[PDB]
């Protein structure tokens, strides 16, 4: 009903590790329109990652985020009662987006201390396939596997 | 309604089997519902008219 495809703004290559993805997650943890604050928090977590995992921070971050990243997406389609779901293959741009959105949401709910250490633990906790983001990805995947039958009819 | 596979390929069998089943399904579904005799003649007459008019323009 629109017939027009929206444009896309540049993602920008990261300014430190030269890994674009850092800028996206920075904007995701953004609150109150604070570019500065968000950068400080996030970059500080890498210093803790060095101090803790004794490995390169960019490598740990890619291994956590790429692993949390899902494959199937279940789109709600109601006809008469409740909704029968439809599993569809997500594009690559949106693929990365759900992982970053999910990483931040479970980071701001942990029982830990300052979100600096909170988000640091979440990223290190997702590199070993044992965390909160994993369970979410597992749950949506299992629903899709359960709902493999209705995949042929989409709309 | 036997159709031999010929054992040369499989698809060809289903390309003929699709047609055979569709004409088979028409009568199979027809002798599923009871219409009065007047209504039964109406659907028979209805299908013939559709097929006729459609056949006129491809010939």
């Amino acid at each position: 009903m629109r017939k027009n495809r929206a444009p896309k703004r540049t993602v920008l290559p990261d300014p430190v590790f030269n890994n674009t993805l850092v800028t996206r997650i920075i904007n995701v943890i953004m609150e109150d329109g604070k570019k500065g604050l968000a950068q400080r928090i996030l970059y500080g977590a890498f210093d803790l990652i060095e101090q803790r995992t004794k490995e390169k921070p960019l490598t740990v971050f890619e291994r956590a985020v790429g692993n949390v990243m899902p494959r199937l997406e279940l789109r709600v389609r109601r006809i008469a009662g409740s909704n029968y779901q439809v599993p569809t293959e997500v594009p690559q741009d949106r693929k990365i987006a759900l992982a970053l959105r999910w990483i931040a949401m479970f980071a701001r709910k942990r029982h830990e201390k300052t979100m600096l250490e909170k988000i640091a633990n979440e990223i290190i906790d997702a590199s070993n396939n044992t965390g909160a983001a994993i369970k979410k990805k597992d749950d949506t995947h299992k629903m899709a596997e359960a709902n493999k039958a209705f995949a042929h009819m989409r709309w | 309604p036997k159709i031999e596979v010929k054992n040369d390929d499989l698809e060809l069998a289903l390309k003929k089997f699709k047609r055979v089943s569709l004409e088979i399904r028409r009568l199979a579904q027809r002798h599923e519902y009871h219409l009065r005799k007047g209504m039964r003649l109406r659907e028979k007459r209805k299908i013939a008219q559709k097929k006729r008019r459609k056949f006129r323009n491809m010939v």
Binding site: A149 | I3, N7, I24, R25, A28, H34
Partner: protein
């Protein structure tokens, strides 16, 4: 223990049935959407018919037959998914004969729900 045989595949609009049988009578194994674990409305979806065919195909292939006459039946919706399921299993489909009961104007069918 038999090389050739018959597999009746009935596809009701509400459910499906796949019966593997000897060239004459005496079915050797059977499977259905209900026995797979699907319940209620999902039993009438072509995907379930393909799933039922895969298990029965696996069971009977370990028993060891090559040539299969496929007696397709019913007027459901997943009438071709089970056929294709056997083909990817690799059994030799020899005939695609159809034996859905057709009447010659015998017995009055039930009333139409409206």
């Amino acid at each position: 223990n038999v090389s050739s045989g018959i597999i009746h595949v009935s596809c009701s609009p509400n459910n499906t049935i796949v019966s593997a049988s000897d060239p004459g009578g005496n079915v050797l194994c059977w499977a259905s959407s209900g026995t797979m674990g699907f319940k209620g409305s999902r039993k009438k979806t072509p995907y379930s018919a393909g799933i039922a065919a895969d298990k029965v195909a696996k069971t009977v292939k370990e028993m060891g037959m090559a040539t299969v006459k496929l007696f397709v039946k019913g007027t459901g919706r997943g009438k071709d998914t089970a056929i294709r399921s056997f083909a990817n299993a690799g059994l030799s489909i020899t005939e695609i004969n159809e034996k859905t009961p057709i009447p010659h104007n015998g017995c009055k069918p039930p009333k139409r729900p409206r």
